[PDB]
Amino acid sequence: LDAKASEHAARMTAMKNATDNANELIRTLTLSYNRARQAAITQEITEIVAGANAL
Amino acid sequence: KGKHVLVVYDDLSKQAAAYRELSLLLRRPPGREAYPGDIFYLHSRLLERAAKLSDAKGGGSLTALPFVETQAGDISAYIPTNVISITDGQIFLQSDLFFSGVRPAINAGLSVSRVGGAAQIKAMKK
Amino acid sequence: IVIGRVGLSFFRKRNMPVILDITRLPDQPSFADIKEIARKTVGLFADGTFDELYMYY
């Protein structure tokens, strides 16, 4: 009984820690994704305008 | 003249960059990544001259091994995509494979030959 | 004497002699679930196979 209780508590704690780590990783990846999206828009518009005014 | 020749282009990316520089200097409007419009036609024209001639033409051959350098293993880039779309096959070398101890670092999943089998000795084919 | 398959894997990977095994067990175990192995464990000491018992949990 003591072993089963300890196993359940350990599983609960490990899953809580894993969930927190996954949430933090999601936040960092979202920040990086937004920066990449802004950079892509900047590059495409710069190329568009350079080609347009190169005539 | 009927001979067999092997040609190695140790970097096509630098040649492409030089052509982009020339085009920009000649006031030709730029395209993607400031590259000119005919950056694909350049390499296609260069690489289509390697061939295996027929017996009526002499039977000679010319084989080419062009090189492309990627950035951080990115294959979706403009020049790598263009060159992959032209050649008969590609051999992939990866840094993680190189440092894991397997040398040459050829990626078997990504590397492919479109003439495989016909270009092998019978024993090797078996 | 090992309960749970991970102990079996550990001791089998090592060079370890294991005599009694039990792997499957409900989440809320009952006395009769492995009373059949508890009886064998006590009967081994009563039989003189080994002279000492320790349990780790």
Side-chain angles (χ1 to χ4, degrees):
Chain A
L1 297 188
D2 207 1
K4 298 303 289 180
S6 300
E7 188 198 334
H8 293 138
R11 284 179 189 291
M12 177 183 76
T13 295
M15 294 296 100
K16 179 190 179 292
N17 291 341
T19 310
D20 298 351
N21 295 337
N23 290 339
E24 177 65 20
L25 180 56
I26 284 156
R27 189 184 66 82
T28 52
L29 285 172
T30 306
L31 288 172
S32 80
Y33 175 85
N34 281 325
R35 293 192 304 256
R37 176 192 65 89
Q38 287 183 27
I41 294 164
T42 305
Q43 192 204 339
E44 73 170 0
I45 191 52
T46 296
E47 290 173 0
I48 286 297
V49 176
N53 67 52
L55 277 296
Chain B
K1 294 176 69 170
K3 303 284 167 271
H4 301 281
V5 193
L6 163 65
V7 188
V8 175
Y9 312 110
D10 204 82
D11 211 340
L12 284 192
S13 64
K14 287 171 179 60
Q15 190 251 334
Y19 184 60
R20 170 177 71 183
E21 170 174 350
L22 286 178
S23 183
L24 286 175
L25 286 173
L26 287 168
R27 310 292 302 186
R28 292 168 171 183
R32 286 168 60 154
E33 293 178 351
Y35 283 107
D38 62 341
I39 197 70
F40 168 83
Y41 176 45
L42 179 86
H43 289 153
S44 291
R45 193 171 73 245
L46 171 66
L47 285 170
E48 281 281 290
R49 291 160 75 168
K52 172 65 171 90
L53 295 179
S54 62
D55 292 331
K57 302 290 288 192
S61 73
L62 194 146
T63 186
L65 304 184
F67 283 40
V68 168
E69 180 156 290
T70 56
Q71 293 294 312
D74 187 21
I75 310 313
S76 74
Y78 196 31
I79 310 306
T81 291
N82 287 344
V83 183
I84 284 172
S85 78
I86 297 162
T87 44
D88 294 322
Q90 71 277 333
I91 289 156
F92 264 94
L93 310 181
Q94 292 198 315
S95 298
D96 51 6
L97 260 55
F98 188 90
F99 288 121
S100 67
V102 59
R103 303 179 197 95
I106 297 164
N107 191 307
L110 290 176
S111 307
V112 75
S113 173
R114 281 177 184 79
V115 185
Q120 285 182 304
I121 295 312
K122 286 181 63 73
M124 184 72 82
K125 204 188 311 191
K126 295 279 183 62
Chain C
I1 320 289
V2 55
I3 308 143
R5 75 174 66 253
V6 64
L8 281 72
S9 299
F10 182 97
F11 287 113
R12 287 211 197 264
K13 185 169 73 174
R14 270 77 173 175
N15 58 5
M16 291 297 178
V18 184
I19 53 174
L20 293 175
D21 301 330
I22 178 64
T23 302
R24 294 293 175 91
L25 188 65
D27 293 331
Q28 292 329 285
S30 188
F31 191 88
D33 301 345
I34 54 169
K35 194 270 294 186
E36 63 173 49
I37 201 66
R39 197 271 296 176
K40 299 181 186 91
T41 304
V42 308
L44 284 184
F45 178 89
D47 197 26
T49 70
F50 42 82
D51 302 351
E52 189 71 49
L53 273 298
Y54 288 101
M55 66 177 169
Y56 301 83
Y57 64 102

